[PDB]
Amino acid sequence: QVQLQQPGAELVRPGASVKLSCKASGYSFTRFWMNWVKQRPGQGLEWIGMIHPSDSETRLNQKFKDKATLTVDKSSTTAYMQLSSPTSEDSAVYYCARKDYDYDAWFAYWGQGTLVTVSAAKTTPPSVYPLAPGSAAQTNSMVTLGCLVKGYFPEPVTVTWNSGSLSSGVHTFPAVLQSDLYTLSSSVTVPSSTWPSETVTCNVAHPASSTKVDKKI
Amino acid sequence: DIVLTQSPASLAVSLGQRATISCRASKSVSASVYSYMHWYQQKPGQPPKLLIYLASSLESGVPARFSGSGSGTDFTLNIHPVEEEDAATYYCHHSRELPPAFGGGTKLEIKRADAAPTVSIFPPSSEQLTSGGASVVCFLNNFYPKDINVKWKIDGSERQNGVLNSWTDQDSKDSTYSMSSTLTLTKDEYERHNSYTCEATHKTSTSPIVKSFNR
């Protein structure tokens, strides 16, 4: 199974540099060309640069010229892209894809993606809190619960209910940036007969800080 | 180079109907009767996925309802019949010249009947109050269309400050919308008031939907 793996996210300060890795498996590494794409939320897709892994021949965009440096490691079957001096505009998700050439060149596979946040702030792990109704009139046969995730930088953060045991009635709301820290909430709706017997837990995981938080409602 | 202009920027089509999205190129991508175009589908939090290549050719594994047509500087993406799972952001790509670029994007939405929101309000947690802060959250789920407004009323008086609202995207299977409203206050601000009310203004209810609790 052809796959392109990438890190979850990367935090960088203004004026510094980053090195991103794209790992290919299940297929010959040098037999294809590695390409990079930039996606900033709301902006859409933007093309970065392509490279020939065998000879390390590069073609870069006039926009990204001198901003990015492409290199490959043929021993590890991994491709690298170095970005110098990221700015507030350079914050975005980066993808690496294998472009398949038959006549026209499309992308048959895409990487996992890496979120690059340019900021001077330091990683803050999230603080999870349970949300319980504590009251009701017995007007509903379903029980709604919620979980608050606040005070964490940078994005993203994983939120599941009972380690993903409940895939239904779950809603994960996008995060809102307040006071340099992101805050989101999530809700789950379980039958009124399930809640008394079964316990509902909020499973939160922060990849950057490598912390896992479990709070029972 | 070759620039792509997609119109419209957002489209809404009812289930069972046909969805047309145009991708116009500044210069001709046609080469030897074979035009360079690619239609990609990207759902939130995922990389794009190929649907039609060479503008005439459906990729193996993609449903037959996806198709494309056109030549030269004019191309279209036709989805008939549209399904609830088809809501996503579509892109068009051109390999003809260098550097390659992608279109502006078109967000497809499904048209259905209206739905009223389910309002649920959770008072601040005992753990958060121990730290000195207080956060009251109000969840609104399964309401269509997305146009809605929430108002916080403490002891019968409205407070517009300290509110954080977040709207979700269209649910693939449900095709509904959900939002949450967070009103942050300190421990003293929370203990000096009793009634906390969350209300919702939606086109399906002449009067706001009242949900509240007493400290």
Residue numbers in the entry:
A (entry chain E): 1 to 217
B (entry chain F): 1 to 215
Article, verbatim:
By using a combination of biochemical, virological, and cryo-EM structural analyses, we identify three types of cross-variant neutralizing MAbs, represented by S5D2, S5G2, and S3H3, respectively, and further define their epitopes.
Thus, the RBD-1 of S-S3H3-F3 appears in a transition state between “open” and “closed”. This S3H3 Fab engagement-induced conformational change may lock the fusion machinery in the more prefusion state, hindering the shedding of S1 and the subsequent transformation towards the postfusion state. S3H3 does not block ACE2 binding to S trimer. Thus, these mutations will not affect S3H3 binding, explaining the observed broad-spectrum SARS-CoV-2 neutralization potency of S3H3 Mab.
